[PDB]
Protein backbone atom coordinates (compact mmCIF):
# COMPACT_ATOMS: atom_id res chain seq x y z
CA UNK A 1 0.00 0.00 0.00
CA UNK A 2 0.95 3.54 1.01
CA UNK A 3 4.29 4.79 2.36
CA UNK A 4 4.68 6.63 5.62
CA UNK A 5 7.84 8.26 6.90
CA UNK A 6 9.26 5.20 8.57
CA UNK A 7 8.56 3.12 5.39
CA UNK A 8 10.31 5.71 3.17
CA UNK A 9 13.44 5.71 5.38
CA UNK A 10 13.64 1.92 5.24
CA UNK A 11 13.21 2.02 1.46
CA UNK A 12 16.10 4.53 1.10
CA UNK A 13 18.39 2.48 3.37
CA UNK A 14 17.65 -0.63 1.27
CA UNK A 15 18.00 1.16 -2.07
CA UNK A 16 20.96 3.37 -1.43
CA UNK A 17 22.52 0.56 0.71
CA UNK A 18 23.33 2.85 3.58
CA UNK A 19 22.21 2.26 7.17
CA UNK A 20 18.89 2.82 8.94
CA UNK A 21 20.34 5.79 10.86
CA UNK A 22 21.91 7.49 7.85
CA UNK A 23 18.68 7.20 5.85
CA UNK A 24 16.87 8.79 8.86
CA UNK A 25 19.35 11.67 8.86
CA UNK A 26 18.89 12.28 5.12
CA UNK A 27 15.09 12.14 5.09
CA UNK A 28 14.86 14.20 8.28
CA UNK A 29 17.16 16.71 6.51
CA UNK A 30 14.98 16.87 3.35
CA UNK A 31 11.98 17.62 5.54
CA UNK A 32 13.73 20.26 7.69
CA UNK A 33 15.42 21.87 4.75
CA UNK A 34 12.27 22.48 2.79
CA UNK A 35 10.46 23.64 5.98
CA UNK A 36 13.31 26.06 6.75
CA UNK A 37 13.39 27.42 3.19
CA UNK A 38 9.64 28.04 2.99
CA UNK A 39 9.54 29.54 6.51
CA UNK A 40 12.21 31.89 5.18
CA UNK A 41 9.92 32.75 2.21
CA UNK A 42 12.33 31.19 -0.27
CA UNK A 43 12.05 28.59 -3.09
CA UNK A 44 13.56 25.08 -3.29
CA UNK A 45 13.77 22.79 -6.31
CA UNK A 46 14.06 19.10 -5.64
CA UNK A 47 14.90 18.10 -9.26
CA UNK A 48 13.49 15.01 -10.88
CA UNK A 49 10.58 15.93 -8.72
CA UNK A 50 9.38 19.55 -8.46
CA UNK A 51 9.42 22.93 -6.65
CA UNK A 52 8.37 24.04 -3.16
CA UNK A 53 7.63 27.67 -2.50
CA UNK A 54 5.34 30.00 -0.62
CA UNK A 55 2.29 31.16 -2.46
CA UNK A 56 0.84 34.51 -1.48
CA UNK A 57 -2.94 34.57 -1.26
CA UNK A 58 -5.43 37.38 -1.13
CA UNK A 59 -9.09 37.22 -0.12
CA UNK A 60 -11.49 34.99 -1.92
CA UNK A 61 -14.99 35.75 -0.86
CA UNK A 62 -16.53 32.29 -0.09
CA UNK A 63 -22.89 26.98 3.88
CA UNK A 64 -25.40 29.46 5.32
CA UNK A 65 -25.17 31.35 2.04
CA UNK A 66 -22.49 33.70 3.30
CA UNK A 67 -19.86 35.49 1.28
CA UNK A 68 -17.52 36.13 4.20
CA UNK A 69 -14.25 37.78 3.40
CA UNK A 70 -11.38 35.41 4.10
CA UNK A 71 -8.07 37.05 4.91
CA UNK A 72 -4.93 37.22 2.77
CA UNK A 73 -2.43 34.46 3.58
CA UNK A 74 0.83 32.73 2.72
CA UNK A 75 0.42 29.01 2.18
CA UNK A 76 2.87 26.32 1.04
CA UNK A 77 2.89 25.22 -2.62
CA UNK A 78 4.31 22.42 -4.73
CA UNK A 79 4.91 22.58 -8.52
CA UNK A 80 5.36 19.13 -9.97
CA UNK A 81 8.02 18.93 -12.70
CA UNK A 82 7.71 17.13 -16.04
CA UNK A 83 9.33 13.84 -14.77
CA UNK A 84 6.91 13.51 -11.91
CA UNK A 85 3.97 14.27 -14.19
CA UNK A 86 5.09 11.58 -16.68
CA UNK A 87 5.77 8.87 -14.06
CA UNK A 88 2.29 9.24 -12.59
CA UNK A 89 0.07 9.66 -15.69
CA UNK B 1 21.64 22.74 -3.95
CA UNK B 2 21.33 24.38 -0.49
CA UNK B 3 19.34 21.16 0.22
CA UNK B 4 22.18 18.99 -0.99
CA UNK B 5 24.53 21.07 1.10
CA UNK B 6 22.45 20.37 4.21
CA UNK B 7 22.58 16.62 3.52
CA UNK B 8 26.34 16.40 2.90
CA UNK B 9 26.74 18.46 6.11
CA UNK B 10 24.27 16.57 8.34
CA UNK B 11 25.17 13.08 7.08
CA UNK B 12 28.92 13.79 6.70
CA UNK B 13 29.33 12.54 3.11
CA UNK B 14 30.33 13.86 -0.38
CA UNK B 15 28.06 16.26 -2.37
CA UNK B 16 27.97 13.56 -5.07
CA UNK B 17 26.78 10.92 -2.54
CA UNK B 18 24.23 13.41 -1.10
CA UNK B 19 23.11 13.79 -4.71
CA UNK B 20 22.74 10.04 -5.14
CA UNK B 21 21.02 9.63 -1.85
CA UNK B 22 18.54 12.44 -2.48
CA UNK B 23 17.78 10.93 -5.93
CA UNK B 24 16.86 7.69 -4.09
CA UNK B 25 14.45 9.65 -1.92
CA UNK B 26 12.95 11.25 -5.02
CA UNK B 27 12.56 7.84 -6.68
CA UNK B 28 10.82 5.91 -3.85
CA UNK B 29 8.35 8.69 -3.55
CA UNK B 30 7.91 8.87 -7.34
CA UNK B 31 7.51 5.03 -7.53
CA UNK B 32 4.81 4.95 -4.87
CA UNK B 33 2.99 7.87 -6.50
CA UNK B 34 3.39 6.04 -9.89
CA UNK B 35 1.68 3.00 -8.38
CA UNK B 36 -1.37 5.07 -7.34
CA UNK B 37 -0.38 5.02 -3.63
CA UNK B 38 0.25 7.86 -1.19
CA UNK B 39 3.38 9.01 0.55
CA UNK B 40 2.49 10.37 3.99
CA UNK B 41 5.03 12.37 6.02
CA UNK B 42 4.19 13.03 9.74
CA UNK B 43 4.55 16.72 10.55
CA UNK B 44 5.21 17.86 6.99
CA UNK B 45 2.49 16.61 4.62
CA UNK B 46 1.15 14.04 2.12
CA UNK B 47 1.65 13.35 -1.57
CA UNK B 48 -1.01 11.71 -3.63
CA UNK B 49 -2.45 11.24 -7.09
CA UNK B 50 -5.52 13.26 -8.02
CA UNK B 51 -7.46 10.94 -10.33
CA UNK B 52 -10.27 12.17 -12.56
CA UNK B 53 -12.49 10.03 -14.75
CA UNK B 54 -13.34 10.64 -18.43
CA UNK B 55 -16.28 13.04 -18.73
CA UNK B 56 -18.35 14.36 -21.59
CA UNK B 57 -18.65 18.16 -21.36
CA UNK B 58 -19.56 21.11 -23.54
CA UNK B 59 -17.46 23.23 -25.92
CA UNK B 60 -17.39 26.79 -24.47
CA UNK B 61 -17.41 28.15 -28.06
CA UNK B 62 -20.19 26.13 -29.77
CA UNK B 63 -22.50 24.41 -27.14
CA UNK B 64 -21.50 21.32 -29.06
CA UNK B 65 -20.46 18.21 -26.99
CA UNK B 66 -16.86 17.77 -25.93
CA UNK B 67 -15.13 14.73 -24.55
CA UNK B 68 -12.97 15.63 -21.56
CA UNK B 69 -10.13 13.16 -21.08
CA UNK B 70 -9.28 11.27 -17.84
CA UNK B 71 -6.36 12.61 -15.82
CA UNK B 72 -3.89 11.95 -13.05
CA UNK B 73 -2.48 15.01 -11.19
CA UNK B 74 0.38 14.79 -8.63
CA UNK B 75 -0.65 16.72 -5.45
CA UNK B 76 0.90 17.71 -2.09
CA UNK B 77 -1.15 18.47 1.02
CA UNK B 78 0.82 20.43 3.56
CA UNK B 79 0.16 19.63 7.24
CA UNK B 80 -0.37 22.09 10.10
CA UNK B 81 3.28 22.18 11.13
CA UNK B 82 4.30 23.39 7.66
CA UNK B 83 1.31 25.73 7.20
CA UNK B 84 2.03 27.52 10.47
CA UNK B 85 5.75 28.09 9.81
CA UNK B 86 4.90 29.65 6.46
CA UNK B 87 2.28 32.16 7.60
CATH number of the CATH domain containing B71: 4.10.520.10
* CA distance to A36, A57, B8, B39, B44, per residue, from A74 (Å): 15, 6, 30, 24, 16
Q: What is the C-alpha to C-alpha distance for residues B48 and B33, in angstroms, rounded to an integer?
A: 6
Q: What is the C-alpha to C-alpha distance for residues B8 and B4, in angstroms, rounded to an integer?
A: 6
Phi first, then psi: what are they for B46, rounded to 5°?
-115, 140
Query: Within 10 A of A13 (CB to CB), how many other CB atoms are there?
Result: 19
Strand order in the sheet with A44-46: A44-46, A50-57, A73-80
Documented resolution in Å? 2.5
Phi first, then psi: what are they for B77, rounded to 5°?
-110, 110
State whether residue B11 is helix, strand or coil. Answer: helix
Q: How far is B1 from chain A (nearest CA, A)?
A: 8
What CA dihedral angle connects A86, B72, A36 and B40, to 10 degrees?
-110
Q: What is the C-alpha to C-alpha distance for residues B63 and B57, in angstroms, rounded to an integer?
A: 9
Contact B28 A12 (CB under 8 A): yes
Range of the domain at A39: 1-89
Select the residue from B3, B81, B84 to test the A interface by mutation, using most A Cβ atoms within 10 A.
B3
Q: What is the C-alpha to C-alpha distance for residues A87 and B33, in angstroms, rounded to an integer?
A: 8
Chain A with chain B: Cβ pairs closer than 8 A = 127
Total domain count, chain B: 1
Q: In which element (H, E) is residue A76 found?
A: strand A73-80
Q: What is the C-alpha to C-alpha distance for residues A76 and A44, in angstroms, rounded to an integer?
A: 12
How many Cα atoms sit within 13 Å of A41 on the Cβ side? 4
Contact B33, A84 (CB under 8 A): yes
Amino acid sequence: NAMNKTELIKNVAQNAEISQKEATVVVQTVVESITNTLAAGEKVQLIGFGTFEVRERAARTGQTGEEMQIAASKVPAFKAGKELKEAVK
